[PDB]
Design a protein around this ligand. Structure first.
Ligand SMILES: CO[C@@H]1O[C@@H](C(=O)O)[C@@H](O[C@H]2O[C@H](COS(=O)(=O)O)[C@@H](O)[C@H](O)[C@H]2NS(=O)(=O)O)[C@H](O)[C@H]1OS(=O)(=O)O
Length: 125
């Protein structure tokens, strides 16, 4: 079943545009925030935009985008933290997290880390 990823940092839903752009939006009705999270192994997921047909990827410089193809940049550790929010940490760039800023823009992976509000998401159906 599809999920919406609600970010604790400002209450933005993770959004994947048809063109590959990634950002955040507060509108629960937005057509581009419905995501498919598929387990590739225990604790490892890909994140696909249902509307966009693109997979969330983190690049070597921390950029977030969504690609048509699934590559090693499209896998993330899904962890339930002690505060009961999930985090999604790049399987390839292992210190960097999927994250949204308070402005609704995505946060560059190299600017993220374990104590931040920006990396915390709650999956909702
Ligand atoms: C409440 O948790 C964090 O702190 C907030 C805050 O202190 O305002 C947010 O930080 C964001 O804004 C501050 C201040 O920016 S300003 O433009 O100078 O006002 C920045 O210093 C932070 O880098 C910003 N972080 S963000 O991830 O880009 O939003 C924010 O809610 C929380 O920051 S956190 O890094 O996610 O913990």
């Amino acid at each position: 079943d599809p999920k919406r990823l609600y970010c604790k940092n400002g209450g933005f839903f993770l959004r994947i545009h048809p063109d590959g752009r990634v950002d955040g939006v507060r509108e629960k009705s937005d057509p581009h925030i419905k995501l498919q999270l598929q387990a590739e192994e225990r604790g490892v997921v890909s994140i696909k935009g249902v509307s966009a047909n693109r997979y969330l990827a983190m690049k070597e410089d921390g950029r977030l985008l969504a690609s048509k193809s699934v590559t090693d940049e499209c896998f993330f550790f899904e962890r339930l933290e002690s505060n009961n929010y999930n985090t999604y940490r790049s399987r390839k760039y292992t210190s960097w997290y999927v994250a949204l800023k308070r402005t609704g823009q995505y946060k560059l992976g190299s600017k993220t880390g374990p104590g931040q509000k920006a990396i915390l998401f709650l999956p909702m159906s």
